[PDB]
């Protein structure tokens, strides 16, 4: 078969995460999914001349069982950690994001990018410069992008699929 990513996509409520992978995956933008509903989606696509599959996790936080939560971030190749430009605890839960998914992986090479998400909006209260930095300390590709818009989409998913084949070449 050809090559599958596995791609989780992580980070508080109301942040974008679905509507993220529903841009990415139907090249909609969705107003309304509801926020507990947590379920995987599937794109062919081609990245850098690579006809492969993404195969992206829309996490919606707590599962019925923390091992749940273990079994897709061991299962999981690249985490997408999101928060929203608009919205200071969101990028200060990145964090804990960062710290759970190296713990459960037990790695301290886990393919990641941050993503600041709504940059359509003008309100904002995470300013560019500051998620440069958390991203600059954890040696990993920042994106803002727009779900919205479309603005960065392909980017933050093809990014994070550059990152796993750095991961893989090792
Ligand atoms: N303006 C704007 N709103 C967005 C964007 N992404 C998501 N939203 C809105 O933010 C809310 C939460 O989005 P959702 O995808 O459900 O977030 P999730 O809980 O992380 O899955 C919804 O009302 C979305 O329409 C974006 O890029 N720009
Ligand atoms: C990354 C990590 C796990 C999965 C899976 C397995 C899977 N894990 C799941 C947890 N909750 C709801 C649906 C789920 N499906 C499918 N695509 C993936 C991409
Ligand atoms: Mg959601």
């Known amino acids: 078969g050809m090559t599958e990513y596995k791609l989780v996509v992580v980070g508080a409520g109301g942040v974008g995460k679905s509507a993220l ?3 990415l995956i139907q090249n909609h933008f969705v107003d309304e999914y509801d ?3 947590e379920d995987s989606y599937r794109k062919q696509v081609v990245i850098d001349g690579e006809t492969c599959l993404l195969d992206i996790l829309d996490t919606a ?7 749940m ?3 897709y971030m061991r299962t999981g190749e690249g985490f997408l950690c999101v ?3 608009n919205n200071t605890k969101s990028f200060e839960d990145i964090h804990h994001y960062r710290e759970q998914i190296k713990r459960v992986k037990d790695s301290e090479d886990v393919p990641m990018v941050l993503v600041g ?3 359509d909006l003008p ?3 995470v300013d560019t410069k500051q998620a440069q930095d958390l991203a600059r300390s954890y040696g990993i590709p920042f994106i803002e992008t727009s779900a919205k818009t479309r603005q960065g989409v392909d980017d933050a998913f093809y990014t994070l699929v550059r990152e796993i084949r750095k991961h893989k070449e090792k």
């Open 69 to 71: 939560r273990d079994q």
């Open 117 to 119: 998400n709504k940059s």
């Open 21 to 23: 992978t529903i841009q």
């Open 61 to 67: 936080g707590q599962e019925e069982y923390s091992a």
């Open 123 to 125: 309100s904002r209260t």
């Open 83 to 85: 928060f929203a430009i």
């Open 35 to 37: 926020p507990t509903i």
